[PDB]
Paper text:
The strict glycopeptide-preferring enzyme TxgGalNAc-T3 then adds GalNAc to acceptor Thr one position N-terminal to existing Thr-O-GalNAcs and is predicted to sequentially O-glycosylate Thr rich repeats within the mucin domain of CST1.
To examine the role of Mn2+N in catalysis, we first verified its presence by solving the x-ray crystal structure of apo TxgGalNAc-T3 in the absence of Mn2+ to 2.9 Å resolution and did not observe density for Mn2+N. We initially hypothesized that Mn2+N was aligning the sidechains for GalNAc binding. However, a comparison of the substrate-bound structure and apo structure shows that the Mn2+N binding residues adopt similar conformations in both structures, indicating that Mn2+N uses an alternate mechanism to influence activity. Loop II is disordered in the apo structure and becomes more ordered upon peptide substrate binding.
Numbering used by the authors: 100 to 418, 426 to 628
The structure:
């Protein structure tokens, strides 16, 4: 069928009904009262499955859109249809079908070309062809524009996303996850934007669904996402926003904003431009970091990445082999000399990043004319703490020569733990960086953990409570209190600064990286 009794809140008709008037899906009782939340979170793969199975598929959500988003009007006839692609692997029936229902009930059929369901080699009895046919038989109860396609073997996100993209028909495709619910008028703002310029990749903002209670919650994250040298998307910090031009430190919720990085895999894009700009790096293995490789390459090769604060999508906040490291390595091909820093932050890994295929990627980058990563930093993300590698002047052991020991993260680069003094051994547990633009002293393996006068590590904040100065005589001076740290007594205490005190004079290797990153041999 095409449509079956439409209406507001159910734009594609009454979904999932049998030819007898009864829902083709039997909701489950209320979850048991004696429910061990940690064990039920497992059963569901990161969320309360008992509760999900008790909630309706036609679950109505709150309108997360700012008020000024509803005063916008869209002429649905002058908009181009789009193909929504939902990849999934072993996603439970209740959350997958609730995603489909949410889309169909919250998308005008006039602008929705199709809803592509990509089975990435699932093994659950209700998905498989050789199973009980629950999914397949339930789809017959949905509009015909809902299509299912399969992968013999699980290929990962990059592999599954491409399968649906290549299969789509609309000029524009929208990627969503398998555990989502939409706010009203979520697709209209994206289509209007990609219509005026096909080089635009537009991200809907992300709200959340609690893993344990399914309560709808505001994402809170802004629009602009930077990145951490651990190669992870990272929302602009307050001091990073302060570096924006005044006209953009607090823009209206209705206007689109550029973002250096993508929050996940949730976006829309004109199909033709998507392939012209490189699509995905199909040699990325399973899941991880494809979103950064897409953002860097997109900006560098004549594209634009934008958010849409008037396009909200709820997304369950849930509570791999050597693949995740391989992915990061390949991403560094787009980072040029900065790869030297990122390589050390992830621990100078030595894997098989599939070099022969990565070279073919580098010739493509050259043949396309993509800009450099230096341009990327100076033009797309100049608000970062490291815009040029000269902003990392020190990277090495922090040694106090008098006691013959150097600092040690104590196996804990993560924030919250006290730092020790240990005999130097040249390992990554004893190396530290310096970000001069913010006065931060961090272990190389975690640029989110910053040293404090307390002697401990803590989450970095671009403020006075984390600003250090490395003096000409080797003192580590906390700028706020004008005190210098000492190794006296194999203990880290703050004292009065005196270049004569040998316990407060330190050595810090200078970070003078090469102008070109040479990938490690395999």
């Amino acid at each position: 069928e095409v449509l079956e009794g439409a209406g507001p809140g159910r734009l594609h008709g009454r979904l999932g009904i049998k030819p007898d008037g009864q829902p083709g899906y039997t909701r489950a009782p209320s979850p048991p009262t004696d429910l061990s939340m940690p064990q039920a979170l497992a059963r569901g793969g990161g969320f309360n499955l008992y509760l999900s199975d008790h909630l309706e598929l036609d679950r109505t959500a709150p309108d997360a859109r700012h008020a000024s988003c509803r005063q916008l009007h869209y002429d649905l006839s002058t908009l181009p249809k789009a193909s929504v692609i939902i990849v999934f692997y072993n996603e439970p029936f209740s959350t997958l079908m609730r995603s489909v229902h949410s889309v169909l009930n919250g998308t005008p059929p006039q602008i929705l070309e199709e809803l592509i369901l990509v089975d990435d080699g699932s093994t659950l009895p209700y998905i498989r062809e050789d199973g009980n046919q629950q999914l397949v038989e339930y789809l017959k109860l949905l509009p015909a524009k809902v299509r299912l396609i399969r992968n013999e073997v699980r290929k990962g996100i990059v592999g599954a996303r491409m399968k649906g993209i290549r299969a789509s028909r609309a000029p524009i495709f929208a990627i969503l996850d398998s555990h989502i619910e939409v706010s009203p008028q979520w697709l209209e703002p994206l289509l209007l934007r990609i219509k005026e310029d096909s080089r635009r990749v537009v991200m809907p903002q992300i709200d959340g669904i609690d893993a344990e209670t399914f309560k709808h919650i505001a994402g809170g994250i802004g629009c602009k996402l930077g990145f951490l040298w651990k190669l992870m998307e990272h929302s602009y910090e307050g001091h990073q926003t302060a570096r924006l031009p005044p006209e953009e430190r607090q823009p209206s919720p209705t206007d689109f904003q550029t973002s250096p990085a993508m929050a996940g895999g949730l976006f829309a894009a004109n199909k033709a431009f998507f392939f012209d700009v490189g699509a995905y790096d199909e040699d990325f293995q399973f899941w991880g970091t494809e979103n950064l490789e897409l953002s860097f390459r997109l900006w560098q090769c004549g594209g634009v990445l934008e958010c849409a604060p008037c396009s909200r999508v709820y997304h369950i906040f849930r509570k791999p082999g050597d693949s995740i490291t391989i992915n990061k390595m390949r991403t560094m091909l787009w980072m040029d000399e900065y790869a030297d820093l990122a390589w050390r932050v992830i621990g100078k890994p030595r894997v098989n990043y599939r070099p022969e295929s990565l070279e073919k990627r580098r010739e493509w980058r050259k043949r396309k004319g993509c800009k450099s990563f230096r341009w990327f930093m100076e033009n797309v993300f100049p608000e970062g703490d490291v815009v040029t590698l000269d902003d990392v002047p020190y990277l090495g052991p922090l040694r106090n020569d008098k006691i013959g020991m150097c600092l040690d993260n104590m196996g804990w680069a993560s924030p919250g733990h006290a730092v020790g003094l240990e005999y130097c051994h040249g390992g990554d547990t004893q190396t530290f960086m310096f970000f001069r633009k913010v006065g931060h002293v961090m272990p190389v393996n975690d640029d989110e953990a910053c040293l404090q006068p307390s002697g401990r590590l803590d989450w970095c904040r671009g403020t006075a409570q984390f600003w250090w100065d490395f003096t000409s005589s080797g003192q580590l001076m906390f700028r706020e209190t004008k005190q210098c740290l000492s190794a006296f007594g194999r203990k880290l205490r703050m004292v009065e600064c005196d270049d004569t005190d040998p316990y407060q004079i330190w050595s810090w290797t200078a970070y003078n990286p090469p102008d070109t990153f040479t990938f490690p041999s395999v």
